[PDB]
């Protein structure tokens, strides 16, 4: 048995297979185009991809049951971390040829691989950039609808806030996969997220503080809204 249905969320699908368990899956927007060593599938003619959560930190947020997932289809999003393309290939699928993504991990060595992908997946801009220095790509992005930050920086807080104040339409949202020690290697995780949700919500409307155990220790996909 290999059965595929719609999920809580737009452009998100759930599948159940021979082992009788369920796994997330996204509508691959590019037939036969496989990033990250995927597990893909095929129903009546469509190539739904397995959004394995060990590999992506959103897999987790979603499989752990996310409530507000501002990433609809059509919605252009800024993305601070696009790296190899993995945790971010899916989010191209969801968005659709009507949506947009400006992705921004700064190690060329890495990014360099996502460059091919964007040939057929013409729905992402592979910006080698730096998101601590926002101005420095004031010319290859535009006002987005969702900032999604996944960066091993320790100031994730003011990074999100500042990219936000630059490119995030009023009423836009924002999602920041926050590592605990990433922000403080001496401060207790529970106590950190209280300080993140604090600083963070001094500019935002805090929608939801979602944990990520047991896919990632002290990880926690916040979802801010810009009033």
């Amino acid at each position: 048995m290999v059965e595929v249905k719609k999920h809580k969320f737009p452009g998100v699908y759930v599948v159940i297979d021979d082992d009788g368990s369920e796994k997330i899956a996204t509508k691959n927007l590019v037939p036969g185009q496989r990033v990250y060593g995927e597990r893909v599938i095929k129903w009546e003619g469509e190539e739904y991809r397995i959004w394995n959560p060990h590999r992506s930190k959103l897999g987790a947020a979603i499989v752990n049951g996310l409530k507000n997932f501002p990433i609809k289809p059509g919605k252009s999003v800024l993305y601070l971390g696009i790296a190899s393309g993995t945790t971010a290939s899916h989010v191209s699928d969801i968005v659709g040829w009507e949506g947009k993504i400006y992705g921004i991990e700064f190690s060329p060595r890495v990014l360099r691989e996502l460059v091919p992908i964007v040939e057929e997946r013409r729905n992402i801009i592979p910006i080698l950039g730096d998101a601590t220095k926002p101005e420095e790509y004031r010319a290859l992005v535009t006002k987005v609808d969702v900032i999604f930050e996944d960066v091993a920086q320790p100031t994730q807080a003011k990074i999100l806030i500042d990219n936000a104040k630059a490119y995030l339409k009023r009423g836009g949202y924002g999602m920041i996969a926050v590592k605990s020690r990433s922000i403080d290697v001496t401060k207790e995780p529970e106590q950190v997220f209280k300080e993140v949700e604090r600083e963070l919500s001094e500019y935002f409307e805090v929608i939801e503080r979602l944990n990520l155990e047991p896919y990632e220790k002290d990880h926690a996909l916040f979802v801010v809204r810009k009033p």
Binding site: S107, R109, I127, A139, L140, T142, P154
Partner: protein
């Protein structure tokens, strides 16, 4: 006022109507890489002038570097981000660009990346070791010029200590008697240095020469250029090979580490301990050149150095494999382990 996009630099009135625009004459990917960074290109100057002869004295750019070089150019410039120019550009791409405006942010989005990103290469760590090895041989040539430009003029040496400030004199003038009070000003000399060198053409002893003069100038010509190159290639290619290792202790000590271990793999294969001493054996531990280790009393160094080696190791491992930039965390982690060492 002034902002940028895939099409050109735009100019905006206090209320957001379009003042003047001008499209990129050279490849966008060539120009952005400069403006975005804060450098001024020919289109950003030409628009700065035509905006002026339209009757403007105020300027606001989105990058504080642009607007700092804008005023060392003459134009008074304030720097505010996001300025109403870009807040006008991004919020309305199609207005300016056309329907397919996105395609256009991508076409040029990609182009620029493929620029900034060096093609995958089997062994660039080896290319670095080389260029590091060279920068060591040029160190010797520079040391060598010293007594030379001086055989004919011993004074200078003490006056200009900084090599690049110094090689200025030779490269351009050569002979003691080629000295002008009006080319003494130019080059960057102070008033004191405008007499400390007008005391040159006519003061002190030194065996003038005419053929020698044009032997040494040929030496400074070839000294600058292998130097820069090496320093600048060693940096911009420490980004492909070991960005973590790099942002940890600066591309040089980085490159020195890769080299000292004779390749990347080799470095990666190194325990904290093997790295705490990689560098020397009265030298002892290349990594001790670290700012915070040096500024500290020997009794505390052994401790910090340990902590560095632990993070340099990681930097290597990831660098070896994936090169995912995790420097920040580690620089953080490290800065937090050291305050406890006090």
């Amino acid at each position: 006022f002034i902002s940028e996009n895939v099409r050109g630099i735009y100019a905006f009135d206090e209320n957001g109507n379009l003042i003047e625009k001008r499209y990129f004459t050279d490849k966008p990917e060539k120009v952005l890489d400069q403006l975005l960074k804060g450098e001024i290109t020919k289109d950003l100057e030409e628009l700065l002038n035509s905006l002026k002869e339209k009757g403007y004295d105020e300027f606001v750019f989105e990058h504080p570097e642009l607007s700092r070089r804008a005023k060392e150019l003459g134009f008074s410039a304030t720097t505010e981000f996001p300025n109403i120019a870009g807040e006008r550009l991004r919020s309305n791409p199609e207005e300016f660009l056309g329907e397919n405006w996105f395609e256009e942010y991508y076409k040029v989005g990609v182009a620029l990346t493929r620029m900034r990103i060096q093609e995958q290469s089997g062994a660039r760590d080896k290319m670095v070791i080389q260029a590091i090895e060279a920068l060591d041989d040029i160190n010797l040539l520079v040391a060598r010029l010293r007594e030379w430009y001086s055989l004919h003029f011993p004074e200078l040496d003490e006056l200009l200590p900084k090599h690049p400030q110094y090689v200025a004199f030779v490269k351009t003038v050569g002979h003691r008697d080629n000295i002008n009070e009006e080319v003494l000003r130019e080059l960057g000399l102070s008033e004191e240095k405008i007499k400390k060198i007008l005391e040159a053409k006519e003061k002190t002893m030194g065996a003038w020469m005419d053929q020698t003069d044009i032997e040494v100038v040929r030496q400074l010509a070839e000294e600058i250029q292998l130097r820069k190159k090496l320093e600048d290639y060693i940096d911009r290619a420490m980004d492909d090979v070991a960005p973590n290792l790099k942002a940890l202790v600066g591309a040089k000590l980085a490159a020195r580490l890769i080299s000292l271990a004779g390749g990347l793999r080799e470095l990666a294969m190194m325990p904290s301990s093997t790295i705490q001493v990689l560098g020397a054996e009265p030298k002892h531990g290349v990594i001790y050149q670290y700012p915070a280790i040096n500024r500290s009393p020997w009794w505390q160094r052994g401790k910090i150095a340990r902590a560095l080696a632990g993070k340099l190791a990681i930097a290597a491992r990831v660098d070896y494999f994936s090169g995912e930039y995790i420097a920040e965390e580690l620089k953080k982690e490290l800065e937090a382990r050291i305050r406890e060492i006090k």
